[PDB]
């Protein structure tokens, strides 16, 4: 298991935006409570799950636990960095797991909900 992605930036000032408020209070909150969220709420523990090839295939690990902490810690300078992390999390799932696997159906359900919410992302302001 690699160290988890950094979730706090000591060199970054605290700044709210409409889009980051939306990404935490609407997007993350809605995905987090979903019945299929749980496999995505923490980094893949390749040791506990005995997946010796996972971190060989996945160069950029990402999960909603990391995204949640990043939003709570105001880690993201803008909405697009956060959207990129969600996209990476889904991509990792689709490139590692066989199509139609339970985890892929769970990712597809969450991604459908994610894109539903991102389509209603507030304007930059």
Ligand X SMILES: CCOC(=O)CNC(=O)CN(Cc1ccc2nc(-c3cc(C)c(=O)n(C)c3)n(CC3CCOCC3)c2c1)C(=O)c1c(F)c(F)c(N=[N+]=N)c(F)c1F
Q: What is the distance between the alpha carbons of residues 92 and 13, in angstroms, rounded to a whole number?
A: 30
Are the beta carbons of 18 and 78 closer than 8 angstroms?
A: no
Q: Contact with ligand X (CB under 6 A): which of 102, 115, 116, 124?
A: 102
Residue 22 or 54: the one with the smaller Cβ distance to ligand X is: 54
How open is the CA angle 18-117-102, to the nearest 5 degrees?
140
Q: According to the binding rule CB under 6 A, does residue 81 interact with ligand X?
A: no
Q: According to the binding rule CB under 6 A, does residue 49 interact with ligand X?
A: yes
Tell me which stretch binds ligand X (CB under 6 A): 11-19, 26-34, 37-45, 75-83: 37-45
Helix, strand counts (H, E) of the chain: 6, 0
Q: Which residues bind ligand X (CB under 6 A)?
A: 39-40, 44, 48-49, 51, 93, 96-97, 102-103
């Amino acid at each position: 298991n690699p160290p988890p992605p950094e979730t706090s930036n000591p060199n970054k000032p605290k700044r709210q935006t409409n889009q980051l408020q939306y990404l935490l209070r609407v997007v993350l909150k809605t995905l987090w409570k979903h019945q299929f969220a749980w496999p995505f709420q923490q980094p893949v523990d390749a040791v506990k799950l005995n997946l010796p090839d996972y971190y060989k295939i996945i160069k950029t690990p990402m999960d909603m636990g990391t995204i949640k902490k990043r939003l709570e810690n105001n880690y993201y300078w803008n909405a697009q960095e956060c959207i990129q992390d969600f996209n990476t999390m889904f991509t990792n799932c689709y490139i590692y797991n066989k199509p139609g696997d339970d985890i892929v159906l769970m990712a597809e359900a969450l991604e459908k909900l994610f894109l539903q919410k991102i389509n209603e992302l507030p304007t930059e302001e």
